[PDB]
Amino acid sequence: FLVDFYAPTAAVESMVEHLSRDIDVIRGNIVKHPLTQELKECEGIVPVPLAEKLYSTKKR
Amino acid sequence: TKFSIYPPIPGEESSLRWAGKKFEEIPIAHIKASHNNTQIQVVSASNEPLAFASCGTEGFRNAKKGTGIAAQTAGIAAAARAKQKGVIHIRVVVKGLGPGRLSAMHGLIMGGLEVISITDNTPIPHXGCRPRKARKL
Amino acid sequence: SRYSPEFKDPLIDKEYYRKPVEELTEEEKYVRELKKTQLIKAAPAGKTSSVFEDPVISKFTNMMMIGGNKVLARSLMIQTLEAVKRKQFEKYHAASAEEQATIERNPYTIFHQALKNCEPMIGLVPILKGGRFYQVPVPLPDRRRRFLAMKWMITECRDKKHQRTLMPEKLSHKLLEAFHNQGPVIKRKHDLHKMAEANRALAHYRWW
Amino acid sequence: AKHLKFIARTVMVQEGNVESAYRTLNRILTMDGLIEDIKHRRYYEKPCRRRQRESYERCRRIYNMEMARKINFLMRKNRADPWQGC
Amino acid sequence: RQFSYLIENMARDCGEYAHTRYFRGGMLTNARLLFGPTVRLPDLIIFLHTLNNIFEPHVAVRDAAKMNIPTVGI
Amino acid sequence: ATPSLRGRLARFGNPRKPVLKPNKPLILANRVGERRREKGEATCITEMSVMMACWKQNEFRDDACRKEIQGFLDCAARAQEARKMRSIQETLGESGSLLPNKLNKLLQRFPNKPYLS
RNA sequence: AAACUCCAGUUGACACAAAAUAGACUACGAAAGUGGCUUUAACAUAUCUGAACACACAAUAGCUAAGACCCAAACUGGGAUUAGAUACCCCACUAUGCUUAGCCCUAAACCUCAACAGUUAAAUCAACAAAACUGCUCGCCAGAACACUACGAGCCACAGCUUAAAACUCAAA
Ligand SMILES: [K+]
Ligand SMILES: [Mg+2]
Ligand SMILES: [Mg+2]
Ligand SMILES: [Mg+2]
Ligand SMILES: [Mg+2]
Ligand SMILES: [Mg+2]
Ligand SMILES: [Mg+2]
Ligand SMILES: [Mg+2]
Ligand SMILES: [Mg+2]
Ligand SMILES: [Mg+2]
Ligand SMILES: [Mg+2]
Ligand SMILES: [Mg+2]
Ligand SMILES: [Mg+2]
Ligand SMILES: [Mg+2]
Ligand SMILES: [Mg+2]
Ligand SMILES: [Mg+2]
Ligand SMILES: [Mg+2]
Ligand SMILES: [Mg+2]
Ligand SMILES: [Mg+2]
Ligand SMILES: [Mg+2]
Ligand SMILES: [Mg+2]
Ligand SMILES: [Mg+2]
Ligand SMILES: [Mg+2]
Ligand SMILES: [Mg+2]
Ligand SMILES: [Mg+2]
Ligand SMILES: [Mg+2]
Ligand SMILES: [Mg+2]
Ligand SMILES: [Mg+2]
Ligand SMILES: [Mg+2]
Ligand SMILES: [Mg+2]
Ligand SMILES: [Mg+2]
Ligand SMILES: [Mg+2]
Incomplete structure (x- = not known):
């Protein structure tokens, strides 16, 4: 099951302690809602040129 | 049907049979190939010991144990004692990267047992106990 | 060697050159055509085209030779063959009709089989690893197996245990025991096999 | 210890050809890097030594992949001489 | 090497000289030793290709400058 | 795809700590490593x-x-013949990848130039 | 060899320890450091440089007090090697590595390559390394050894750290 809710920051810590004492909860994790974060638009993939001038042009 | 290298799922229904026994009921032959010794134990689906053999129990001691031929000798002996109790098909679960990793499996084949599945269960910690220090060889 | 590398070993085989041309294959015909343009070494005195020639016996005779004394070396060989045949003939006449069927009286068949029974199937090679020498079992080449059979037979005959016993008597006595899977030479093969089997866990040391 | 058994790193033997199945299992472990991980885990590799080994391998990979690319790039020139005698 | 045959024929037709082969060291700077004390060096060198077969400047380009021989190069 | 080399090495422009510390310059050579002979292994152990x-x-x-x-004796014959064929015919047959001797001739036709000419 | 045999193998239960793969990524932080997951707080400066009389930090090792016990492991003990082996190899185990609080203030703390703003043109440039330079400011350096030393001074440091000489000696380093 998924529970979506609006709570203050201090309410997150208290809820985690509550879920641990519940014997009917197999596992309970509180995370940020992924829809709140806005995915920045991606232009694409820019090719990476081969690194140059890494060594001197002296005749070894 | 095309052969699938992936083992059948115990929950699912599969048509593959080996002498009328499903994949989950096949006895298991666990192999522990250490750097110095090879221990082979054959157990059934209900975790009932059937046959056990090792290089130390088959006329090899000290450095002689850490050899492929010693593991092969143990594999033949392990098959012989398992074959007495009615074992025909085995599932191989090899643990370790020792010299007897494959030779011990050969002894089972030449001893009258059939290999249907191979599984590697080498313990790899995901970060775990800090191993011993490097040798100054 | 005074022979130039262009020289080729002569082939001493009467039936080889009497084979009809039709039976020859294309490659076999090419070999015959090629040899007409190749220099051929002179035939050694030891090898001949006689039907009585036995390569094993001549090889054994050479190994018995001391200081180039082939006349004495061959004399000991022929006396041994005569002694074996005479000993079998005495046993044949002293045996019943049923026993006479299984008695072998051919000296060559006894000699060839006796050497075969002494050939070791595996050998030992001392391998230097970890500052120590281990007798690692190895497979033996076909030439090495036959050479060991002859050398073992000769060494036992030359042993100091035998007192005032002529070589034809010692050699004939050991050949019969080898032909019957008995004697020290056969025991030598078993001892080599036992050591090789006992050190079978060291067979991984060899790198070939 | 808490996952389902006979699923991970399991190869089914086809028609009794155990040799092919074991090589397939060995190759899968090698490709995923399990084989190399186990060997380095036999004796502890200190963090200073691990970084030096990783840097060597990363530099080795760059040179190996660059040299391989040039060999494939120039492989088309491995033909016979088109101007023999000149 | 592709145009080596053409250049040699062109030089013969116009009564001039061509060197389309491997350039042995010292053909210009050490010419008095390779040929003789009275050899005459070229008064003009023309490069139809100024690069060798390893994509580097031809040795004669540097050598001709040393021997104050003008060069015309493509 | 070749891993990028931008910012990996410690240089004047690079502000960050180095990523790679190569003991040799990262420049393609004109030669490749010679073929390494296979390490010898014991043969016909099973038959023995x-x-x-x-x-x-x-x-x-x-x-x-x-x-x-006879089974072990036959195995030794096959192993001896295969070893001689592998050492001679396979090496001369140039099976698989191109030989380093022939590969080096191609590489020196297009040498790597880390300098300016 | 010693050790273990109250052991080993399969199965189940089962951390105050350590964080495969991703990572062929090259990000964050002043540096030291930082690579399992979640949440909270949070990542200085609208010009730059600037305190080795100042303040706040500083891997690892170590001290102090109370705990945690898997593994690894100074010292130590045993086994072996060796002319001897107070080492390299093997085994067992402690300090220690972890947590809390307070110390200690060192490193090849090195990317041995200062901060900011620029340039790729001339003479580019001893060598090697990781091309050569401009403007400005701060820190630092003036033969080797004595010397990461003596003395003085400061410090929760007391077998310590920081600052740091001299005489004699050499014509090299
Ligand atoms: K992890
Ligand atoms: Mg767990
Ligand atoms: Mg940064
Ligand atoms: Mg270096
Ligand atoms: Mg290589
Ligand atoms: Mg003991
Ligand atoms: Mg367990
Ligand atoms: Mg931790
Ligand atoms: Mg951590
Ligand atoms: Mg990694
Ligand atoms: Mg986190
Ligand atoms: Mg977080
Ligand atoms: Mg900031
Ligand atoms: Mg400031
Ligand atoms: Mg500290
Ligand atoms: Mg501490
Ligand atoms: Mg104290
Ligand atoms: Mg304590
Ligand atoms: Mg321990
Ligand atoms: Mg102690
Ligand atoms: Mg001791
Ligand atoms: Mg402890
Ligand atoms: Mg550091
Ligand atoms: Mg510094
Ligand atoms: Mg500054
Ligand atoms: Mg700048
Ligand atoms: Mg220069
Ligand atoms: Mg100090
Ligand atoms: Mg001091
Ligand atoms: Mg003073
Ligand atoms: Mg003082
Ligand atoms: Mg300081």
């Missing part, structure tokens, strides 16, 4: 083990172990 197993059961009598003896 089978042949020696019967000797223990039959008190080292060859008459009762003729079949197993």
Whole structure:
């Protein structure tokens, strides 16, 4: 099951302690809602040129 | 049907049979190939010991144990004692990267047992106990 | 060697050159055509085209030779063959009709089989690893197996245990025991096999 | 210890050809890097030594992949001489 | 090497000289030793290709400058 | 795809700590490593083990172990012939990848130039 | 060899320890450091440089007090090697590595390559390394050894750290 809710920051810590004492909860994790974060638009993939001038042009 | 290298799922229904026994009921032959010794134990689906053999129990001691031929000798002996109790098909679960990793499996084949599945269960910690220090060889 | 590398070993085989041309294959015909343009070494005195020639016996005779004394070396060989045949003939006449069927009286068949029974199937090679020498079992080449059979037979005959016993008597006595899977030479093969089997866990040391 | 058994790193033997199945299992472990991980885990590799080994391998990979690319790039020139005698 | 045959024929037709082969060291700077004390060096060198077969400047380009021989190069 | 080399090495422009510390310059050479001979391994151990197993059961009598003896003897013949063929015919046959001797001739036709000409 | 045999193998239960793969990524932080997951707080400066009389930090090792016990492991003990082996190899185990609080203030703390703003043109440039330079400011350096030393001074440091000489000696380093 998924529970979506609006709570203050201090309410997150208290809820985690509550879920641990519940014997009917197999596992309970509180995370940020992924829809709140806005995915920045991606232009694409820019090719990476081969690194140059890494060594001197002296005749070894 | 095309052969699938992936083992059948115990929950699912599969048509593959080996002498009328499903994949989950096949006895298991666990192999522990250490750097110095090879221990082979054959157990059934209900975790009932059937046959056990090792290089130390088959006329090899000290450095002689850490050899492929010693593991092969143990594999033949392990098959012989398992074959007495009615074992025909085995599932191989090899643990370790020792010299007897494959030779011990050969002894089972030449001893009258059939290999249907191979599984590697080498313990790899995901970060775990800090191993011993490097040798100054 | 005074022979130039262009020289080729002569082939001493009467039936080889009497084979009809039709039976020859294309490659076999090419070999015959090629040899007409190749220099051929002179035939050694030891090898001949006689039907009585036995390569094993001549090889054994050479190994018995001391200081180039082939006349004495061959004399000991022929006396041994005569002694074996005479000993079998005495046993044949002293045996019943049923026993006479299984008695072998051919000296060559006894000699060839006796050497075969002494050939070791595996050998030992001392391998230097970890500052120590281990007798690692190895497979033996076909030439090495036959050479060991002859050398073992000769060494036992030359042993100091035998007192005032002529070589034809010692050699004939050991050949019969080898032909019957008995004697020290056969025991030598078993001892080599036992050591090789006992050190079978060291067979991984060899790198070939 | 808490996952389902006979699923991970399991190869089914086809028609009794155990040799092919074991090589397939060995190759899968090698490709995923399990084989190399186990060997380095036999004796502890200190963090200073691990970084030096990783840097060597990363530099080795760059040179190996660059040299391989040039060999494939120039492989088309491995033909016979088109101007023999000149 | 592709145009080596053409250049040699062109030089013969116009009564001039061509060197389309491997350039042995010292053909210009050490010419008095390779040929003789009275050899005459070229008064003009023309490069139809100024690069060798390893994509580097031809040795004669540097050598001709040393021997104050003008060069015309493509 | 080749891993990027931008910012990996410690340089004047690079503000961050180095990523790679190569003991040699990262410049393609004109030669490749020569082919490494395969490490020798013991052969016909299985056949030898089978042949020696019967000797223990039959008190080292060859008459009762003729079949197993021939099996090991045949294996040695195959191993010897294959080893000679692999060392001679396969090496000369140039099977698989191009030989380093021929590969180096191609590489020196297009040498790497880390300098300015 | 010693050790273990109250052991080993399969199965189940089962951390105050350590964080495969991703990572062929090259990000964050002043540096030291930082690579399992979640949440909270949070990542200085609208010109730059600037305190080795100042303040706040500083891997690892170590001290102090109370705990945690898997593994690894100074010292130590045993086994072996060796002319001897107070080492390299093997085994067992402690300090220690972890947590809390307070110390200690060192490193090849090195990317041995200062901060900011620029340039790729001339003479580019001893060598090697990781091309050569401009403007400005701060820190630092003036033969080797004595010397990461003596003395003085400061410090929760007391077998310590920081600052740091001299005489004699050499014509090299
Ligand atoms: K992890
Ligand atoms: Mg767990
Ligand atoms: Mg940064
Ligand atoms: Mg270096
Ligand atoms: Mg290589
Ligand atoms: Mg003991
Ligand atoms: Mg367990
Ligand atoms: Mg931790
Ligand atoms: Mg951590
Ligand atoms: Mg990694
Ligand atoms: Mg986190
Ligand atoms: Mg977080
Ligand atoms: Mg900031
Ligand atoms: Mg400031
Ligand atoms: Mg600290
Ligand atoms: Mg501490
Ligand atoms: Mg104290
Ligand atoms: Mg304490
Ligand atoms: Mg421990
Ligand atoms: Mg102690
Ligand atoms: Mg001691
Ligand atoms: Mg402890
Ligand atoms: Mg550091
Ligand atoms: Mg510094
Ligand atoms: Mg500054
Ligand atoms: Mg700048
Ligand atoms: Mg220069
Ligand atoms: Mg100090
Ligand atoms: Mg001091
Ligand atoms: Mg003073
Ligand atoms: Mg003082
Ligand atoms: Mg300081």
